[PDB]
Symmetry: D2
């Protein structure tokens, strides 16, 4: 798949399991249209959100529901979510891995972009 | 004084200067209405965005325009911007510092809530 | 293998290839004895440093040669290396993934620890 | 004044207070000789470690004792400490700020070199 999301828990040193992820795409009228969604697995990875055909050029927003994750563990975190906004496929199809590392008052995100 | 934004450049080891910062507040219809904005200083810091009187409880979004920062430096970035969305709560007096550490394909954000 | 090291490049959004890694173990006399070494592959991962039998309890230091990495790309970075120092296997054997994300003036490291 | 250390807690969103910090300088025999040390303040900062006169070119190691910080809070940490090893260079006047953001199983360190 051309898009994978991986989430890690910096407090426990583990994948972040069952984290809800919503992906949006900017439409012609500059509104965020729903594009794909899912939940991270036991490995902290969410595969299969999209296909090469559906994943056209555009501006995408990956919304990782960090608050609900921490709340279920009893922590009141700072952020409502972690959002990753980027232009995709504007130089041809690529493969994207969006990684997020989560702490109650911090998060970091990095992207690994490869060419098939 | 209740809200401060600080941006750092991890490629150059320096403050990220002249980074545009836009703050929004979530309206009742769940839209993002403009609230405050500015540009980071020589020290990478942006002070005086809001006041105690105006910074009521609610959900705020801080948008750091990281793409134009890297483009001015001639470095290809991944992100359109960095986004920090949080709930301001009054539980005692509190000051919010949102720090962001920028790399072309990565950013980290952390918030220090004190006093 | 019970120990894997993964290195990512935050400037290019890619694995950090050919990064030298040296692992040390604190001996009885508190000196760092050489334990294992290797280079990250095309995926940024270094596998096979050790075995379950050799990877006893102890204090280990993972030295990632970040400076040489950036220098070969023409960048003069801040750090001489990134070092990850931790006690291992003190509650029984575990599996450890040491991840490092590199920028010229910054690095972050996180560990994923799992129980077989 | 040429060297400042700042430590932050990503679990609590706060300065990391009373964190022991040990600085070493690499001797000619490549051993680590003690150079300066202290504890972080209420603001998570440690100032006045060294002076311009004493902070000559050379390789320095800054050791942040993160394990005792988390143990005092009753949280199991991964690392023994966080280590920052760098070359001090005189190429113009420069000030070094080593910042560290701490989580139980993760830390990030960044250095701002200015002026």
């Amino acid at each position: 798949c051309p898009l994978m999301v991986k989430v890690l828990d910096a407090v426990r040193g583990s994948p972040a399991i069952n984290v809800a992820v919503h992906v949006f795409r900017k439409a012609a009228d500059d509104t965020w249209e729903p594009f794909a969604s899912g939940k991270t697995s036991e490995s902290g990875e969410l595969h299969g959100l999209t296909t090469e055909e559906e994943f056209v050029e555009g501006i995408y927003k990956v919304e990782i529901d960090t608050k609900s994750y921490w709340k279920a563990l009893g922590i009141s975190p700072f952020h409502e979510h972690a959002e990753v906004v980027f232009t995709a496929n504007d130089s041809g199809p690529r493969r994207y891995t969006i990684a997020a590392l989560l702490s109650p008052y911090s998060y970091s995100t990095t992207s690994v972009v490869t060419n098939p």
